Every structure is written in C-alpha cells, then in structure tokens.
Amino acid sequence: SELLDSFETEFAKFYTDSNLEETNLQKCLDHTHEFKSQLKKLKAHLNKHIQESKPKRKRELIIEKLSKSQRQWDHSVKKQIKYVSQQSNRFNKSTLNKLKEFDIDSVYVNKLPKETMENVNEAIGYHILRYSIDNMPLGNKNEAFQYLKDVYGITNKESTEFIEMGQIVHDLKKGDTESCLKWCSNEMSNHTALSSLKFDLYTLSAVNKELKECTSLFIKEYCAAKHIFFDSPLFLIVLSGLISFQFFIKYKTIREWTTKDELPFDVKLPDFLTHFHPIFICPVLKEETTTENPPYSLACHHIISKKALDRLSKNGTITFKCCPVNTSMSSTKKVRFVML
C-alpha cells in the first residue's frame, strides 16, 4: 500500500525523465566522449598549424584550450560520479527503513527433519510434472521420459499419465482436435461430464475465449478419470503457510517448543482448505475429541466426549442427564463423522 508507492517514487530517481534506458552514468560517458572529441580537434588544428608553418596569437589560445578541456573533463566526471554514489547510498535509507524489520528466518521452529528430504524432492517432482509439463522441449512420444529422468528427476508411475496429458493438451492447443475426440470416445464411467466435454470440443471444431474453457474441462475430466489429483499437494500447503504468517507474528508480539502438542493461536484459513476432515468440539468439557477420547451418543440424540461421559458417570451409574431422559452405558454408541 503506502510502502510500495513510497518505494517506487524513491526508485524512479535512478532514472532520468524517460523513466527507462537513460541511466545516470550516461553523463560520464558523454563527458568523456566530448573530451576525446576536443582533443582530436586540437590535434588536427596543431597539425595544420605546423604543416603550414613550413617556410603569434594562435598557440597562446590552443594551449589554453587544452588546459580548459582537461579541467572541464575531470571536474565534471568527479561531480557526476559523486552524485551517483550519493544517490545510491541514499536509496539505502529507504530500502532499509522497511525491509529489515521482519527477520523471516526467526519463524522457523519445529525444524523439518533432515532425513526426509527425498519426500520433498518427490512433491517437487509431482508439482513440476503437473503444472508445468508442456513448457519444456521434450520431443518424441517416449524418448522424453529419459530426458525427464536425466535433467530434473522422475516420480513414480504418475509420470506416464502426465506425459500423455501434456501431449494431448499441447496438440489441442494448436487447433488440431480429432485426438481429444478419440480419447473421449475410448473411455466408455460417468457419461454426463464426458458427453458435455465431447459437445464443448465439438463446438470448438467449428476462439481465444473458447480454448481456455475447453482445455480446463479436459484437464478436469482427465484428472478425475485416471485418479491422480487436480491441485498439487504442495501448492495448497504453501498457500496455508502464506496465510499463517500474520497470525504467527501477532502471537509473537503478544508473547513479549509449545507443549509438544497443538500449536497455539488457532489460525483461521478459508473454507476450501478446511472442508477435508471434520473437527468437533465437546460441548461440556470444551476439548476436541481425539483418537483417544472418541465421542459417544447417549440415547438422547446428543453427542458428548467419552471422558466427560466417564466423569458424568463414575463407572456408568444410571445417572441420566444431558430432554432430561438420557441413560447410562447400556444405550450409548460410538460415532465417527464422515464428511461425505
């Protein structure tokens, strides 16, 4: 917001009015060029004078001219270089006031174990193989698997499917259908979306706003048909990491590793990264039911955690509260929430 604008305004001072391509050292280059030109002119004049001298208010001007040339040249060069040095040393007093107040590396706690760096090197392999496969010179149909294995690195059997995906997508990008049609017509699964894709690309067979709406559909229906993924398991994780910084720094500044368990400060993040596993909070003791202490239903059609149940009843005496019409452990059952 304010920092970015106050940064661009300070940075533009490196350039002249053109905003581009005319940096400050052009002054020094121009001055040295002019100095050389002046010496060349003086050389020509002196040569002519001596040549015509072969059988005075002239020399007493050329010598002074040489003196004047050297004074102007060195004075101007020194002044310009001094100004550019001072400007470069003053831009630090605006790249320093802001960008040196965070110390990103101070947040690295719970260090990622040094033994598991192959798994990171497989997640990276998958992300490169998925999001950015077509933007590489590969070549033949199968003489590119060796190139992948040789330059970057190869993942598990989830590379053949991505080679085929990249091939068909790139072929379809060049306005040459009749291969995606064959692919769609060979896999006959859910008929509905496949037929919709067939119709969309058939419409494409009859533009710049249509390709971007057909490649995406084919990508979705290929990923959902060969059972792999649609978003990399690394991109979502980097997203959540980018979202948790603000809350972490807020907690850090309130405070002035953590109980070997649940980290504090209850970061909140958008829905489409939260609708995976259902999280339930006990209504009587206020604790998230874990693998141990699993929730029970108590014949009143309520849900309470098991530990709270076993402190509501010592060993399970008929004490039946929660509709005061509950009952003890002859009519209670285990539950597991599935986000179908």
Partner 1 sequence: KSIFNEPDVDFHLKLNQQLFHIPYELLSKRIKHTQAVINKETKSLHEHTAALNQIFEDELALAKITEMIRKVDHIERFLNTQIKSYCQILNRIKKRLEFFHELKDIKSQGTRTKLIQWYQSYTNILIGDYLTRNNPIKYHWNSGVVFLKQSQLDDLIDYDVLLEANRISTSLLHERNLLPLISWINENKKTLTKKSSILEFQARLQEYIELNLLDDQRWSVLNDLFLSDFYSMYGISQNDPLLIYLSLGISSLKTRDCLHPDLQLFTLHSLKRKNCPVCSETFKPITQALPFAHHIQSQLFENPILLPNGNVYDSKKLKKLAKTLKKQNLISLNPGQIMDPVDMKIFCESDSIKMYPT
Q: Binding to Zn ion (CB under 5 A): which residues in 171-190?
A: none
287-290 long-range contacts (CB < 8 A, ≥24 apart) are none
2 versus 261: smaller Cβ distance to Zn ion: 261
Give the residue, chosen from 18, 110, 140, 315, that forms a contact with partner 1 under the rule CB under 8 A: 110
Would you count residue 98 as binding partner 1 (CB under 8 A)?
yes
Would you count residue 303 as binding partner 1 (CB under 8 A)?
yes
Closest CA to 304 of 291, 286, 319, 318: 286
Cα separation, 202 vs 308, whole angstroms:
61
Would you count residue 47 as binding partner 1 (CB under 8 A)?
yes
Instruction: Return the residues of window 253-282 that contact Zn ion according to CB under 5 A.
Output: 277
Would you count residue 338 as binding Zn ion (CB under 5 A)?
no
Would you count residue 111 as binding partner 1 (CB under 8 A)?
yes
Binding range to partner 1, per CB under 8 A, among 116-124, 160-168, 173-181, 201-209? 116-124
310 within 8 A of 288, measured Cβ to Cβ: no
Q: In the sheet that 333-334 helps form, which strands lie side by side, from edge to edge?
A: 303-305, 295-297, 333-334
Cα separation, 161 vs 167, whole angstroms:
10
Give the residue, chosen from 18, 54, 93, 135, that forms a contact with partner 1 under the rule CB under 8 A: 135
Instruction: Return the residues of window 166-205 that contact partner 1 according to CB under 8 A.
Output: 190-191
Binding range to partner 1, per CB under 8 A, among 108-116, 160-168, 171-179, 201-209? 108-116
Helix (H) or strand (E) holding 305: strand 303-305
Give the residue, chosen from 17, 52, 105, 256, that forms a contact with partner 1 under the rule CB under 8 A: 105
Would you count residue 163 as binding Zn ion (CB under 5 A)?
no
| Strand pairing category for 333-334 and 295-297 | antiparallel
159 within 8 A of 133, measured Cβ to Cβ: no
Q: Which residues bind Zn ion (CB under 5 A)?
A: 277, 300, 302, 322-323
